[PDB]
Amino acid sequence: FPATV
Amino acid sequence: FPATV
Amino acid sequence: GAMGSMERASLIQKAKLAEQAERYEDMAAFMKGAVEKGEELSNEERCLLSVAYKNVVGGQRAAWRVLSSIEQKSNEEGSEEKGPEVREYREKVETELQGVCDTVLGLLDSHLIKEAGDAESRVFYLKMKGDYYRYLAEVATGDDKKRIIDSARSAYQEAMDISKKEMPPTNPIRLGLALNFSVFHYEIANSPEEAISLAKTTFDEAMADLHTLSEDSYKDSTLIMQLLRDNLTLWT
Amino acid sequence: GAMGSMERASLIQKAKLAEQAERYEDMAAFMKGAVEKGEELSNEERCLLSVAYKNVVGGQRAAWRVLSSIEQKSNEEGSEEKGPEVREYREKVETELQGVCDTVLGLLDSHLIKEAGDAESRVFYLKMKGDYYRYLAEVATGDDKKRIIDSARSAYQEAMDISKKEMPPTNPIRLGLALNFSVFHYEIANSPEEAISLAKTTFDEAMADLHTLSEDSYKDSTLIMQLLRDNLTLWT
Ligand SMILES: *SCCNC(=O)C(C)(C)Oc1ccc([N+](=O)O)cc1Cl
Ligand SMILES: *SCCNC(=O)C(C)(C)Oc1ccc([N+](=O)O)cc1Cl
Ligand SMILES: [Mg+2]
Ligand SMILES: [Mg+2]
Ligand SMILES: [Mg+2]
Ligand SMILES: [Mg+2]
Ligand SMILES: [Mg+2]
Ligand SMILES: [Mg+2]
């Protein structure tokens, strides 16, 4: 999965 | 801490 | 609210204790209680609220993905029928996840967003609104799926418009918003080109502004810039 | 019980799904429902029950230790008074932990132990009874603290007596029971010499019996033997 903050 | 199972 | 009898300051203190103890459900309940006191949140308090719910929903999302994967494999050819249990349990986790999202969105709508006038608070809350609609979109399949997606898009877009007018390109909230809206484009809106364009433009505009920053601000901004680069590497 | 309407087999299936999803609270609730159907548990089902509650209480114990450490530092000299919040929140976690222990002990008493006739089931449940009294003892400070400790000791001792009569020295349940009873001696009963003696004798008697085992049984037994050695290295 791609990075989120 | 010591090991327990 | 079960937190109605506890002092606001005690709720914030206990949220910090819960974080140290990795008790994120408690942390979220304490922060919900603090929001419901009706006063605006400081920057640190907004961080506590977001950290608590991000961890709670993150665990639910991970569990939902595991169960959805099992459910999909059970529906392939040659798979032995094993009854309704996998769907039922995936639905149970999904319903709990939706409940947490609805709770966060309810706090934002009553009444965090409408009282948030400074860019740092308003962009932060609108980013959260986009995030929690995005989590609803990840599990949505019904008549309202397009409206859930558009709700995420609309909140992210208002946050982007404010952030571009009112924040420097290195502001960590602006960067994190762009990171997440880019992921929205890639994983929700079937728009990988828009995701890639947004991540690249955000990275390049932040890079050109790093020279204005102190050492500590530089560390914060470059950390999020690296996440943008990580996604770009994943996608290209 | 909220699980009263679900089939026993569906509860077991969902417990396994919950384990895969790392949803240990759900796993424990499903297994509690399965126990409450009133039928005896198979070896795999006993494992699911123990894994679920071990993970739930393990997380509570870790959180309790974090909070107790903060509370103790707040009570040192020169520490700024910060109110009742740390004690209150430690007490909240402690009460939840005690509730989980009481729930497990209740399942064992009504009626798992009394129907367990084979050594493998009876020793397993008595080990669990000792473990959950041990967790109660870790947080106990009141009039009944000595009785809680003796309840753990008594359950462990009955399990040891059965295991020595009815199981080979390499049996993994016998080994895990000895490991945990040794830790009881060291960390609860203020008896480090007994802890060390038990771990060493258990290790040496298992070592002498390994020659009787298949490759797969050897792997299971040596894994627990290594934990005994790890504790001995920690203690000597
Ligand atoms: S709000 C959590 C605490 N984080 C921070 O203060 C820093 C600046 C280290 O990182 C932030 C801040 C804000 C956001 N955001 O997307 O709103 C992301 C990050 Cl990594
Ligand atoms: S019950 C959990 C599954 N574990 C096992 O079957 C093996 C044999 C791998 O390990 C066991 C079994 C029983 C116990 N015990 O103390 O009751 C411990 C371990 Cl590590
Ligand atoms: Mg007040
Ligand atoms: Mg649904
Ligand atoms: Mg553009
Ligand atoms: Mg039935
Ligand atoms: Mg107490
Ligand atoms: Mg002896």
Residues 6+ apart with CB under 8 A from C76: none
Q: Among C24, C123, C131, C175, which residue has the most ligand 1 atoms within 8 Å of its CB, making it the best to mutate?
A: C175
Exposed e or buried b per residue across D123-151, where buried means at least 16 C-beta atoms within 10 angstroms of its C-beta:
bbbbbbbbbbbbbbbbbbeeeeeeebbeb
Measured CA angle at C100 (ends D56, D9), to 5 deg = 50
Identify which of C89, C19, C93 has the alpha carbon closest to the alpha carbon of residue C57.
Answer: C93
DSSP class of residue C83 equals -
Q: Measured between CB atoms, does D29 come within 8 Å of chain C? A: no
Task: Round to whole Å and give the CA distance between C50 and C32.
Answer: 11
Identify which of D176, D160, D175 has the alpha carbon closest to the alpha carbon of residue D209.
Answer: D175
Query: Would you kindly state where each structural domain of chain D is located, as residue ranges?
Result: 8-235
Exposed e or buried b per residue across D46-84, where buried means at least 16 C-beta atoms within 10 angstroms of its C-beta:
bebbbbbbbbbbebbbebbbbbbebeeeeeeeeeeeeee
Length of chain D: 236
Q: Where are the alpha helices (DSSP H) in chain C?
A: 8-20, 24-35, 43-74, 85-107, 113-115, 119-139, 145-166, 172-187, 192-207, 215-235
Q: Rounded to the nearest whole angstrom, what is the distance from the C-alpha of residue C216 to the centroid of ligand 5? A: 29
Task: Round to whole Å and give the CA distance between C208 and D70.
Answer: 44
Provide the 3-class DSSP secondary structure of residue D216. helix
- Residues C98, C104, C110, C112, Cα dihedral to 10°: -160
Identify which of D130, D128, D198 has the alpha carbon closest to the alpha carbon of residue D169.
Answer: D198
User: Is the CB of D176 inside a 6 Å radius of any atom of ligand 2?
Assistant: yes
- The fold of the C8-235 domain, in CATH, is Delta-Endotoxin; domain 1 (1.20.190)
Q: Whose CA is nearest to atom 13 of ligand 2?
A: D173
Residue corresponding to tokens 């530092």: D73
Q: Which residues line ligand 1 (CB under 6 A)?
A: A 5; C 47, 50-51, 124, 127, 172-173, 176-177, 220, 224
Identify which of D227, D22, D226 has the alpha carbon closest to the alpha carbon of residue C67.
Answer: D22
How many C-beta atoms surround the C-beta of residue C230 within 10 A?
Answer: 14
Task: Round to whole Å and give the CA distance between D127 and D162.
Answer: 11
Report residue D49: phi and psi, to 5°.
-60, -50
Residues 6+ apart with CB under 8 A from D227: B3, B5, D179
Provide the 3-class DSSP secondary structure of residue C67. helix
CA quadruple D222, D224, D226, D229: dihedral positive or negative?
negative
Identify which of C132, C171, C177 has the alpha carbon closest to the alpha carbon of residue C157.
Answer: C177
Q: Rounded to the nearest whole angstrom, what is the distance from the C-alpha of residue D95 to the centroid of ligand 7? A: 6
DSSP class of residue C123 equals H
Q: Rounded to the nearest whole angstrom, what is the distance from the C-alpha of residue D51 to the centroid of ligand 2? A: 9
The number of the ligand 1 atom at minimal distance from the alpha carbon of C50 is: 1
Peptide bond into D185 cis (omega under 30): no
The identity of residue D38, as a single letter, is G
Using alpha carbons, list the distances in angstroms from residue D229 to D91, D184, D194, D196, D214.
35, 16, 15, 10, 22
Structure tokens given for C163: 């952030």
Cβ distance of A2 and C224 shorter than 8 Å:
no
Task: Round to whole Å and give the CA distance between D195 and D199.
Answer: 6
Q: Rounded to the nearest whole angstrom, what is the distance from the C-alpha of residue C202 to the centroid of ligand 5? A: 9
Using alpha carbons, list the distances in angstroms from residue C22 to C218, D18, D62, D133.
28, 20, 9, 24
The identity of residue A5, as a single letter, is V
Residue corresponding to tokens 């392939």: C76
Give B5's contacts in chain D (Cβ within 8 Å): 176, 179-180, 224, 227
Identify which of C92, C86, C51 has the alpha carbon closest to the alpha carbon of residue C69.
Answer: C86
The identity of residue C71, as a single letter, is E
In Å, the largest CA–CA distance within chain B is: 13
Secondary structure (DSSP) of C21-55: TT-HHHHHHHHHHHHTT-PPPPHHHHHHHHHHHHH
Element (H, E) at D227: helix D215-235
Task: Round to whole Å and give the CA distance between D217 and C153.
Answer: 56
Cβ distance of D230 and B5 shorter than 8 Å:
no
Task: Round to whole Å and give the CA distance between C154 and C150.
Answer: 6
Counting as contact any 3 or more CB pairs under 8 A, the partners of C are A, D
Cβ distance of D183 and B5 shorter than 8 Å:
no
Task: Round to whole Å and give the CA distance between C163 and D56.
Answer: 42
Element (H, E) at D26: helix D24-35
Residue D220, CA atoms < 13 Å, CB-side half-sphere? 12
Residue corresponding to tokens 């932990």: D97
Q: How far is CA C173 from the centre of its chain?
A: 12
Secondary structure (DSSP) of D60-90: HHHHHHHHHHHHHHHTSTTPPP--SHHHHHH
Give C2's contacts in chain D (Cβ within 8 Å): none
Structure tokens given for D226: 């290594």
Structure tokens given for C230: 């990580």
Secondary structure (DSSP) of D177-198: HHHHHHHHHHHTSS-HHHHHHH
